[PDB]
Amino acid sequence: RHRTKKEIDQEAAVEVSQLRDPQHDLERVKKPEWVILIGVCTHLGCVPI
Amino acid sequence: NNAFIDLPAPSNISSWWNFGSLLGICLILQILTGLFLAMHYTSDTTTAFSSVTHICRDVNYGWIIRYMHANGASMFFICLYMHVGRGLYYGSYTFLETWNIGVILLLTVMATAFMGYVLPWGQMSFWGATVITNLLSAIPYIGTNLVEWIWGGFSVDKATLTRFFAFHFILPFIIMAIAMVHLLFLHETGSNNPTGISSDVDKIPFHPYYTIKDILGALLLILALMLLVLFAPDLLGDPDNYTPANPLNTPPHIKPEWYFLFAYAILRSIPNKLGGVLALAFSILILALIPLLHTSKQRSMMFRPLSQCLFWALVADLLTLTWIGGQPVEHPYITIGQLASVLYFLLILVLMPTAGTIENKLLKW
Amino acid sequence: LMKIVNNAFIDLPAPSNISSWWNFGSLLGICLILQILTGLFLAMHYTSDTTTAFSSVTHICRDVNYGWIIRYMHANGASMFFICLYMHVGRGLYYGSYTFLETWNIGVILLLTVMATAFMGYVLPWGQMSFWGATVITNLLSAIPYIGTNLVEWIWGGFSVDKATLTRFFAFHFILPFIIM
Amino acid sequence: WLEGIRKWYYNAAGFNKLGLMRDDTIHENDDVKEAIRRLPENLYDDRVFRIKRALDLSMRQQILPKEQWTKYEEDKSYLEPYLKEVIRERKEREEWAKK
Amino acid sequence: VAPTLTARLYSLLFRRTSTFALTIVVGALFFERAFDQGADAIYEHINEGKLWKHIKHKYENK
Amino acid sequence: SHTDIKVPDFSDYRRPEVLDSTKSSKESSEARKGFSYLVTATTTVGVAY
Amino acid sequence: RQFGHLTRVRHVITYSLSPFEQRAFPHYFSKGIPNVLRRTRACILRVAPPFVAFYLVYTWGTQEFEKSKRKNP
Amino acid sequence: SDLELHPPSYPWSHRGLLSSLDHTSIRRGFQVYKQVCSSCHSMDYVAYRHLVGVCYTEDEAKALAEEVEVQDGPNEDGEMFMRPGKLSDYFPKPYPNPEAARAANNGALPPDLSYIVRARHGGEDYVFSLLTGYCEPPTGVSLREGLYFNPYFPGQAIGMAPPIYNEVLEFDDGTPATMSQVAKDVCTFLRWAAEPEHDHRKRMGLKMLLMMGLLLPLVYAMKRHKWSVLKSRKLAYRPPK
Amino acid sequence: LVDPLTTVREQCEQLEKCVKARERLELCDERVSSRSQTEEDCTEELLDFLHARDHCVAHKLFNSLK
């Protein structure tokens, strides 16, 4: 996924301590404008929209 | 003979007692149409969906056998739910062996129908295979391993479809053997009746009284089945399964087969993985607890007003959960579903046993 | 649960002198269970379309973990089945066991059903013998006057052995063993 | 008055409409079966006929004329003295089995 | 003295188990032709002008 | 006395042809069996179809 | 369980008529309807309410849902 | 947007329980698919032979198949070649694969149409509404290039430009080809395509209803006959006093 | 060449419910149109209008088609 600036800024602003699986966005991407993920819901396997 | 012809039966069992034979007929119907479909079905992911359209378009009468099988599965569940409801209402569950085997039968039919739905490899087939097998991933430490082992890989794929055809093929025959055991335990006691009172002082022979009544019931079952097959074959189905499986995309309004909607609503009401899976399992397994929760001095609900009111509340609640399962996860459905899910377990575990005790008190025993 | 497992096994009265020739009945039960167990596992990887049947069998033997042992156990188990069947029938003829008329005649039906079952299984891998065996044996029915040929084409699902034949044979081969049981 | 809802309940339960007495409707477990076995001829035969009459009405999905309904004030526990003793006997045995 | 209709039917076809099965075989055969012809006629009339058999003449001419 | 036992009146259930206690019921037996057996034969024909 | 070994019964007489001597539909409508009405009335208070509740929850929730999807509910 | 516009119910002549499809309408609908929709949409489960005795004679269908060239082979040189189509051929695909399809359609994928009516809630009511429902975006809505506003499509932004309009094709029977007429006929054809067994199941259903009208009361009569023995039985209790 | 769809749509747009809806639609068009910035669009108003008009079209249209 090619992320926009507003999207990147929204993810940086997240209150990590409030997440159930706490991670800063920058611990999950290498180049901020790009997010790469396995598109499989961690619940029961469907594809997130 | 004596297993049929001169089998003693209560003189007063009602139409609610016709569902056992109707379940036998649904089972035979599924086996017969099933085998004939299996004569033209191929389980390779490259050709499964195609073989099904080939059955419906080019095999002589392939379409009627197919829709009879699909709608037959729906009739199977209608009958199963009526059969279980009769049992709860009339206290038939006190026949412990018969009842517990029945619970196994319900789970096996559910598992069987699940796998069959995966066979045409449409969109619902694929995501159903994904979600349901993943229920096992809630099992700690080894859950994920169990899922991959069932799948034969890291995702639902060819290996999955091929083994599911095999499992779906044999399970109904196992169900048939389990059902014969179901009946053998029943025969040790004979049937219960609407009054919940022993009917040994007024037994009549199964033949001709119930043989003809069962035939009349069979005719009504066939009418219901054929009204669906000939006039509305897709009414109880899902349009999304007319779309071949697409591993890259889960339809936005994906929903389970109607007979699984109540359980799906219950699982969806809990925002926790393990919790939702445990509630799902328990929503079915709680049937095994009903006998231990019986507090009434009387077997049937016929003479118990308060219990009857709570029984219909449970049915109305399952109807609510069925409706909620068909709605998006949005307000106010999220909350209605949570209340309905809580109400379900509350009626069975607390309100009904309590009504039983109150009724005893009111009768002074 | 106890009885009929149980008085039908544990305290079942048996002659004190039956010999090894009486072992084939239980060996046939074991051959049947073996075929059913290896059969189901093979069926988990086998596909009945003529374009992929032969291939799915090589996939079983080459890539499925231990697929080769399950396959050759199924193939050779069918041979063991017949060795035992013939020893079992021979024992019966020699010792006059056939005087148990019902048991004996049911046995004759069992022999025929196992033969038909093994025939259909052999057709499944769709090799040369599979194809010509399907052709010849189904054609035995063409000897039936008036309708023979019609019966054959009906069994085949066409004017010759083809896709429709292989697919229904997988279904027949799948269920018959349980009927045999 | 509790008693007020009691007569109301009795009629709502409705076994009286089939001519049954409360004890004719008890769920039969081993204690109850033993108690029924201990009943004197007349109480046993009467029970049998009331149950038989009730099963017959149920089969026809009918009820008795209101004047024939078991009356609340006249329903008595014919089974109680017998069942109570059967239970007492079993409890005594269970106590002994624990010692 | 002329007996009713069901009476004649009883004596003529229902009393003997052989004759009672014959009647059902032959009856079913007549019932089959009449029922299919009648129902097919009802279906085609309800759908007059819409079925291939109704418009077919416009495209053939062998 | 067992002679005090009389069969209850069934006139409300009797087919009309057997309502007269002063007439032989054999006169209508073939007609009555014919009616019921006709229901059975027709049913069997419909089922065969 | 076999006839002959079910239970003990004494002093009960049963009178029956051959199905060929009687009507299969005696007072079908004249007495059947009143009985259906009676049975229907006797249970309605126990069966219907929960379903009425379902109906109310159903209509309320559906309306609430639609209203929430627009600009001015 | 997340808003939804559900399609109204059109009075299709095949709507009724015992109502068959209009075969002249299926025939015109096929012409629509052929002339218009086939350039972007495949219909992989229908072959020319399926049209025979439905909306075309065997010779007409044969001529239709020959209007196209299909690949066959290998020949004795191990090569593929082209030949006129025949009755056993399935309708030609406009693209070799979905990637080529998406590429040819600004990234959107024209779905296969064999089951589109059974694969969409609303069926032909939905398809008819979609085809005849394109309109200007409402004030405040701006779509990316490649997308068209259609109130009936989920999200209202569809990758398919309006495919039909007045005189988009000429019918073999001279029927005026107005946009609504064209939509109505293609939808009737799409119903047949998704459910060729349509007319036969209704004819069978008529027979089922008639047979049930006969068998249900007869079996019920048989039930009441046998049960009369019990329904009129009388009981008497005569204990010793 | 006139499409009866045009005729029928025109006739149906005369219904009270359709005019009311068209009015709300134009009110939204004017409101949204006059702001250089606004999140709002008139999708809802358009759909309400269409739902009313198309329900009416469906009852008449097919009488004019073959």
Ligand code: HEC
């Ligand atoms: C290429 C120029 C096309 C022609 C000619 C027709 N359609 Fe089409 N169609 C096309 C695309 C690219 C898409 C995808 C749209 C998207 O945004 O996903 C479609 C889609 C459809 C659909 C499905 C809509 C849905 O609900 O998903 C249908 C029913 C449809 N098209 C029908 C259809 C018919 C019958 C046509 C001939 C009149 C027709 N289309 C032509 C591209 C093109």
Ligand code: HEM
């Ligand atoms: C493949 C599924 C099933 C089949 C074929 C089947 C069949 C039968 C049959 C033939 C009867 C006798 C007729 C009757 O009273 O209905 C019966 C009775 C009964 N069954 Fe089932 N059954 C099935 C599932 C179940 C389930 C799921 C339950 C409940 C969890 C169950 C519980 C019972 C009980 C308690 C009885 C005794 C009923 C009574 O006498 O009141 N059955 N079953």
Ligand code: HEM
């Ligand atoms: C307890 C009995 C059975 C149940 C409940 C059942 C249920 C189902 C269901 C729900 C489907 C999906 C139907 C669809 O929408 O296409 C299916 C498919 C199928 N079933 Fe079964 N089935 C049963 C027994 C059998 C048996 C015995 C066989 C075969 C030996 C069989 C063969 C098939 C085949 C080949 C298909 C795929 C084609 C199709 O989808 O129709 N089924 N089954």
Ligand code: HEM
């Ligand atoms: C009386 C029991 C059985 C007999 C005698 C039997 C016999 C045979 C024979 C002779 C073959 C050909 C083996 C070869 O490849 O050379 C075969 C293949 C096959 N059988 Fe069976 N079989 C039995 C039971 C089963 C059952 C119960 C199933 C499945 C549920 C099954 C599934 C298969 C499959 C999948 C093949 C194809 C793969 C292969 O060729 O190994 N068989 N069987």
Ligand SMILES: C/C=C(C)/C=C/C=C/[C@H](OC)[C@@H](C)[C@@H](OC)[C@@H](C)CCc1oc2c(O)c(OC)cc(OC)c2c(=O)c1C
């Ligand atoms: C190899 C065999 C295996 C792994 C068998 C497993 C059997 C499991 C259970 O049967 C005993 C299971 C079928 C039963 O649970 C009690 C059902 C009520 C579960 C119902 C169920 O259905 C869904 C479904 O159908 C879908 O379709 C497209 C989609 C779904 O969500 C997106 C669901 C879902 O979320 C649930 C809870």
Ligand SMILES: C/C=C(C)/C=C/C=C/[C@H](OC)[C@@H](C)[C@@H](OC)[C@@H](C)CCc1oc2c(O)c(OC)cc(OC)c2c(=O)c1C
């Ligand atoms: C749908 C199911 C059907 C039609 C089942 C039919 C079953 C028939 C019989 O079983 C009961 C049959 C197998 C059994 O006859 C008693 C065998 C001894 C017949 C043996 C047999 O084998 C051959 C074979 O294997 C071949 O392989 C390449 C080739 C063959 O000649 C070229 C033969 C052959 O000439 C015969 C007689």
Ligand SMILES: CCCCCCO[C@@H]1O[C@H](CO)[C@@H](O)[C@H](O)[C@H]1O
């Ligand atoms: C037997 C009466 C069933 C009630 C008819 C509605 O039935 C429902 O229709 C929906 C779409 O219209 C489907 O998605 C759903 O699966 C189906 O159960």
Ligand SMILES: CCCCCCO[C@@H]1O[C@H](CO)[C@@H](O)[C@H](O)[C@H]1O
């Ligand atoms: C489910 C409702 C239970 C309420 C307890 C019933 O209470 C009873 O109600 C009767 C009729 O209203 C009164 O005549 C009677 O005096 C009263 O005690």
Ligand code: FES
């Ligand atoms: S929310 Fe359950 S699989 Fe994604």
